[PDB]
Design a protein around this ligand. Structure first.
Ligand SMILES: NC(=O)C1=CN([C@@H]2O[C@H](COP(=O)(O)OP(=O)(O)OC[C@H]3O[C@@H](n4cnc5c(N)ncnc54)[C@H](OP(=O)(O)O)[C@@H]3O)[C@@H](O)[C@H]2O)CCC1
Ligand SMILES: NC(=O)C1=CN([C@@H]2O[C@H](COP(=O)(O)OP(=O)(O)OC[C@H]3O[C@@H](n4cnc5c(N)ncnc54)[C@H](OP(=O)(O)O)[C@@H]3O)[C@@H](O)[C@H]2O)CCC1
Ligand SMILES: Cc1cc2nc3c(=O)[nH]c(=O)nc-3n(C[C@H](O)[C@H](O)[C@H](O)COP(=O)(O)O)c2cc1C
Length: 355
């Protein structure tokens, strides 16, 4: 089974290619990692296995979901250290995903009830609705379009959060550049309506992700940095007129960052809703594919050279031992969407059984 051949993800020797995809679960009450997160990640950790955390706030203005963790305060660092230690005790490698939602927020999630930030002043349309802390769905508000000083300060929030992740003991970080969140609001020509140096051309639209990646690479080293993008996912009104050219432009910038720093990123992670293989073939380094994989599709992805690692989201929610079940070809257990984003520390979180 090619999912069980070892793979060297730069400094990390992985024993198998089954990755835990980043998944927001909303159990980090008041944005503080809780003991329940330790139990959840410990259950899914395996010796030589790679795990990516739920998206994690980089600043007080970065959230658009309830009870998501941050890594911008020292209290959050101290609590994440306890989770990282239990995962490392199982021999697993873990990266923290750094997540800023940009315009995909609401006054209830912002300090002082202020408008969320973005590349643009346009709101997500009412085709989409935001999950509220009480479980209802609300209306995305108009964001405020930030200037270039504020862009540079958001870049600094990613830099400081990456340093905090290393302080908590994470092996590295993943930049969340996918799914219509802040970085994608700069990348996608369906959103970015700027006329300054961060808008118009494809090159200008790629400036923000390039600067985020360069800052975290400078702070923690490229081998501790993964980057996640989704050029073909149009969630939250985040379409591009040419998804493949946008993906190849991002890949080119990643390749240039690596050549200039003299070091390779941990990986490029692309999640989908031929494009995938084209981006993989253009990127000088490790490729993680994601979206709709099953045991057989992940085996095929690695066997046919389409990816080096395969990340699983929903199946890992309900199969804590997904790695072993894939190894044994044991039947997988269903997941319950109703408890994806609830707050209970156990129900639908750590109470899915093992084999
Ligand atoms: N933080 C993220 O990147 C999130 C991505 N998500 C992606 O958003 C989209 C919608 O997710 P959903 O759980 O709201 O319902 P859906 O999968 O569309 O049925 C999916 O593509 C999902 O993979 C879930 C929400 C959080
Ligand atoms: O213009 P400057 O402000 O000097 O650089 C902007 C960004 O591009 C980076 N950069 C500077 N030349 C290059 C280069 N040929 N290739 C790819 N990145 C570069 C440069 O990296 P360093 O400051 O050298 O670490 C920086 O991150
Ligand atoms: C409940 C849930 C939460 C998610 N949260 C995140 C997240 O925090 N960051 C992210 O990049 N993707 C997130 N995703 C997308 C997943 O990482 C993954 O790409 C997606 O579920 C498609 O893969 P799958 O078919 O293996 O589930 C989330 C998906 C789900 C279902």
């Amino acid at each position: 089974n090619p999912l069980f051949s070892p793979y060297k993800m730069g400094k990390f020797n992985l024993s198998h290619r089954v990755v835990l995809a980043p998944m927001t679960r909303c159990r980090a009450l008041n944005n503080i990692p809780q003991a329940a997160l330790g139990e959840y990640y410990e259950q899914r950790a395996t010796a030589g296995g790679f795990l990516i955390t739920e998206g994690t706030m980089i600043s007080p203005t970065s959230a658009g979901f309830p009870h998501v963790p941050g890594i911008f305060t020292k209290e959050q660092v101290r609590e994440w250290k306890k989770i990282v230690d239990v995962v490392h005790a199982k021999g697993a490698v873990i990266f923290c995903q750094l997540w800023h939602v940009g315009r995909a927020s609401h006054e209830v999630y912002q300090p002082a009830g202020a408008a969320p930030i973005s590349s643009t002043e346009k709101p997500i349309s009412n085709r989409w609705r935001i999950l509220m802390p009480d479980g209802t769905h609300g209306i995305y508000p108009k964001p405020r379009a930030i200037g270039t000083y504020e862009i540079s300060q958001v870049v600094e929030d990613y830099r400081r959060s990456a340093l905090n992740a290393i302080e908590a003991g994470f092996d590295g970080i993943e930049i969340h550049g996918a799914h219509g969140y802040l970085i994608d609001q700069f990348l996608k020509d369906g959103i970015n309506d700027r006329t300054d140096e961060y808008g118009g051309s494809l090159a200008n639209r790629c400036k923000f992700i390039t600067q985020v990646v360069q800052a975290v690479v400078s702070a923690i080293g490229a081998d501790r940095v993964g980057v996640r993008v989704s050029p073909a996912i149009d969630h939250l009104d985040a379409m591009d007129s040419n998804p493949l050219s946008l993906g190849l432009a991002v890949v080119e910038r990643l390749n240039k960052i690596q050549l200039h720093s003299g070091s390779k990123l941990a990986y490029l992670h692309v999640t989908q809703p031929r494009l995938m293989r084209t981006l993989r073939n253009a990127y000088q380094g490790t490729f993680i594919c994601s979206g709709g994989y099953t045991r057989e599709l992940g085996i095929e992805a690695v066997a046919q050279g389409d990816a080096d690692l395969v990340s699983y989201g929903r199946l890992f929610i309900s199969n804590p031992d997904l790695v072993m079940r894939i190894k044994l070809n044991a039947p997988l257990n269903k997941y319950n969407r109703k408890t994806f984003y609830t707050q209970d520390p156990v129900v639908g979180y750590t109470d899915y059984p093992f084999l």
